[PDB]
Amino acid sequence: GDTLNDVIQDPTRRNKLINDNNLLKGIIMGRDGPVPSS
Amino acid sequence: GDTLNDVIQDPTRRNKLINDNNLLKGIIMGRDGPVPSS
Fold it and tell me: In this complex, how many residue pairs, one in chain A and one in chain B, have their CB atoms less than 8 Å apart?
């Protein structure tokens, strides 16, 4: 029964969560709609 | 048949219980409703 705490305490899992969710990247509000920035 | 006593006597399980339930964190009473503080 792992939670976000177990993910955050592990650098590999924390960075996987950060990367897979684009948490370091802003969002481009284009006229066609929002898209994550690369 | 473990109880809260077995959880509390073990530092790992006690801290898992504390962390997974935000027991050290207050609650923000916003106009949209209560939310746990980070």
Answer: 5
Check if the beta carbon of residue A17 is closer than 8 Å to that of residue A6.
no
Give the determination technique: cryo-EM
Angle, CA A34 vertex, CA A19 and CA A4 arms, to 5° = 35
Rounded Cα distance between B17 and A1, Å, is: 11
Q: What is the Cα–Cα distance from B1 to A21, expressed in whole angstroms?
A: 39
**Residue B17: CB partners within 8 Å, gap ≥ 6?**
B7, B8, B23
Question: Measured between CB atoms, does A9 come within 8 Å of chain B?
Answer: no
Contact of B22 with chain A, judged by CB distance below 8 Å, is answered with: no
